[PDB]
Ligand binder design. Structure first.
Ligand SMILES: CC(C)CCC[C@@H](C)[C@H]1CC[C@H]2[C@H]3CC=C4C[C@@H](O)CC[C@]4(C)[C@@H]3CC[C@]12C
Ligand SMILES: CC(C)CCC[C@@H](C)[C@H]1CC[C@H]2[C@H]3CC=C4C[C@@H](O)CC[C@]4(C)[C@@H]3CC[C@]12C
Ligand SMILES: CC(C)CCC[C@@H](C)[C@H]1CC[C@H]2[C@H]3CC=C4C[C@@H](O)CC[C@]4(C)[C@@H]3CC[C@]12C
Ligand SMILES: CCCCCCCC/C=C\CCCCCCCC(=O)OC[C@@H](O)CO
Ligand SMILES: CCCCCCCC/C=C\CCCCCCCC(=O)OC[C@@H](O)CO
Ligand SMILES: CCCCCCCC/C=C\CCCCCCCC(=O)OC[C@H](O)CO
Ligand SMILES: CCCCCCCC/C=C\CCCCCCCC(=O)OC[C@H](O)CO
Ligand SMILES: Nc1nc(NCCc2ccc(O)cc2)nc2nc(-c3ccco3)nn12
Ligand SMILES: CCCCCCCC/C=C\CCCCCCCC(=O)O
Ligand SMILES: CCCCCCCC/C=C\CCCCCCCC(=O)O
Ligand SMILES: CCCCCCCC/C=C\CCCCCCCC(=O)O
Ligand SMILES: CCCCCCCC/C=C\CCCCCCCC(=O)O
Ligand SMILES: CCCCCCCC/C=C\CCCCCCCC(=O)O
Length: 388
């Protein structure tokens, strides 16, 4: 048996390394948002919320993890706080991730109302509630759902703890049914599945809005080709009737309104010519539609197409952040599941336990790199602060 202090030294060094990067990179996220007013959205108030969570992983949770791993003697309820605080920060991150996803769904589904419905004063109120909830969920073991009432007292006498003290060890004070049923299933897993559903709807609503754009556009010019080589006023009538409905449908800030005002007006004129039975001047009236289409309607088709692609790109960035949360945190939860559901199994070896803790802490480093690579306003603000 190698002296514990040697493997301890690898663990502590790595933890300290991670804390440094967690703090630095996430202090940069918060500086960027404060400086650049382009970055002050309700979306970014939640990303600053989870940057705060990540900062406190490095300043508090990682120091707590280092000391919990020693088994130091302590009063059991003080042990519980050291051991559970990180669950507060984990829960806060889940709420922030959930909020961002809901915000990005509102953005894409009802852009009309978004600015009305979502505002930075209520966002701040939502964030405070979420932290309070996060202390409640994460510090529930201290309200009585703990193992303090039954100390492993042979382990306490071996390390020579004083009376009322335990050897502070996570799986000794925190019950595993809390961790698996209440923490993992209800408080982590259920919210993640909800996130998964929100993102599914977002990509669905963007995909079928693009289809509706391209449908209305193809409806516009096929009707035109029908008008073109028509026979009577009755068929010209139909293919402008389908154009105008498609115009009003596609319509749903000043040069855009012109473009359609001319378009439906041009249609409307060809319509009455058709009704009065003059076919070929109804045709001729309908092909300067072609002029308005090229000068106006397709710059609308294109910049609307350009904006949906930005919103999907922004929603895929947010999705990556949530996915990396799940990746970094699931192994620990899965190991607790084995520990709890299979008492016939050998406990996961100690080195794997610490690999899983280290991997969960690593999540506190990744997000700043995700912003810098994937959202240009963040990346250029990062550059501006760094060089200055
Ligand atoms: C705002 C920030 C800077 C303050 C951080 C407060 C932390 C470091 C404080 C608050 C509660 C503290 C202790 C709570 C009670 C106990 C039980 C005792 O037997 C050993 C010390 C121990 C385990 C704690 C030590 C650290 C402690 C956790
Ligand atoms: C990418 C992420 C989400 C998947 C992570 C899969 C990991 C966490 C899975 C894969 C294989 C797993 C277990 C394989 C079998 C053993 C031996 C058993 O006595 C304790 C659990 C233990 C030690 C494993 C626990 C963790 C386990 C390592
Ligand atoms: C990954 C997301 C989508 C769902 C999480 C699935 C979890 C709950 C699933 C995946 C693998 C599962 C089990 C793998 C095999 C065993 C050994 C058995 O003796 C007790 C159940 C146990 C220990 C697992 C229980 C929980 C289990 C870990
Ligand atoms: C104890 C609590 C300690 C908290 C530490 C981390 C919080 C510090 C980060 C919180 C600061 C948020 C910020 O400045 O940016 C947002 C604004 O620009 C919005 O307009
Ligand atoms: C994501 C979808 C949710 C998946 C969770 C399924 C959890 C079901 C896991 C239950 C494991 C179990 O019952 O072990 C049996 C032992 O107790 C008997 O020896
Ligand atoms: C222990 C709790 C520590 C910090 C609380 C979390 C700090 C969260 C920082 C979020 C700040 C923010 O998002 O700013 C809102 C803005 O005022 C909208 O108008
Ligand atoms: C805002 C920024 C401020 C930064 C804040 C720094 C965070 C505190 C660091 C580590 C806390 C862990 C300390 C707990 C270790 C206590 C050990 C102990 O209690 O020794 C008792 C002995 O074993 C017999 O009782
Ligand atoms: N099971 C567990 N253990 C620990 N630390 C104890 C690692 C260990 C496990 C067994 C042992 O005999 C000595 C040490 N931290 C832990 N953190 C979590 C956790 C936090 C959030 C989700 O899981 N689980 N967890
Ligand atoms: C990503 C970073 C890669 C490095 C990962 C190394 C993780 C730590 C494994 C160290 C195992 C030592 C067990 C801890 C001993 C103890 O505290 O009781
Ligand atoms: C920006 C400020 C960050 C504050 C971090 C403070 C650094 C402390 C580092 C690790 C503390 C580990 C304490 C060791 C536990 C006690 C040992 C024992 O009781 O046996
Ligand atoms: C829901 C939001 C409110 C959450 C907080 C509610 C109050 C819990 C107060 C319990 C007092 C803690 C004492 C536990 C103990 O020391 O044994
Ligand atoms: C375990 C399910 C993980 C879901 C994470 C949510 C990320 C959504 C990705 C699209
Ligand atoms: C490389 C990182 C680890 C990858 C997968 C770990 C698989 C777990 C195997 C260890 C089982 C321990 C045991 O049963 O004795």
């Amino acid at each position: 048996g190698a002296p514990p202090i040697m493997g301890s030294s690898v663990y502590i060094t790595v933890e300290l390394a991670i804390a440094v990067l967690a703090i630095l990179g996430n202090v940069l996220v918060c500086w960027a948002v404060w400086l650049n007013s382009n970055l002050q959205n309700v979306t970014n108030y939640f990303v600053v919320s989870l940057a705060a969570a990540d900062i406190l992983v490095g300043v508090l949770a990682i120091p707590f993890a280092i000391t919990i791993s020693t088994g130091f003697c302590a009063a059991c309820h003080g042990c519980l706080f050291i051991a559970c605080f990180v669950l507060v920060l984990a829960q806060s991150s889940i709420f922030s991730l959930l909020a961002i996803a809901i915000d990005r769904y509102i953005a894409i589904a009802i852009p009309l109302r978004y600015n009305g419905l979502v505002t930075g004063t209520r966002a701040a109120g939502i964030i405070a509630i979420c932290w309070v909830l996060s202390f409640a969920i994460g510090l529930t073991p201290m309200l009585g759902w703990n193992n303090c009432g039954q100390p492993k007292e042979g382990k306490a006498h071996s390390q020579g703890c004083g009376e009322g003290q335990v050897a502070c060890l996570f799986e000794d004070v925190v019950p595993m049914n809390y961790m698996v049923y209440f923490n993992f299933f209800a408080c982590v897993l259920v919210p993640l599945l909800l996130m998964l559903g929100v993102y599914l709807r977002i990509f669905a609503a963007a995909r079928r809005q693009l289809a509706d754009l391209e449908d209305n556009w193809e409806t516009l010019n096929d009707n035109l080709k029908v008008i073109e080589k028509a026979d009577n006023a009755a068929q010209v009538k139909d293919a402008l009737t389908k154009m105008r409905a498609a115009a009003l449908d596609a319509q749903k800030m000043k040069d855009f309104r012109h473009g359609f005002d001319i378009l439906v007006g041009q249609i409307d004129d060809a319509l009455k010519l058709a009704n009065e039975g003059k076919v070929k001047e109804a045709q001729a009236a309908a092909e300067q539609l072609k002029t308005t289409r090229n000068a106006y309607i397709q710059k609308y088709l294109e910049r609307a197409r350009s904006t949906l692609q930005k919103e999907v790109h922004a929603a895929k960035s947010a999705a990556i952040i949530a996915g990396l949360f799940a990746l970094c945190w699931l192994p620990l939860h899965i190991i607790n599941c084995f520990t709890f559901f299979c008492p016939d199994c050998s406990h996961a070896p100690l080195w794997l336990m610490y690999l899983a803790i280290v991997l969960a802490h690593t999540n506190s480093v990744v997000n700043p790199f995700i912003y810098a690579y994937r959202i240009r306003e963040f990346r250029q603000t990062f550059r501006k602060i760094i060089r200055s």
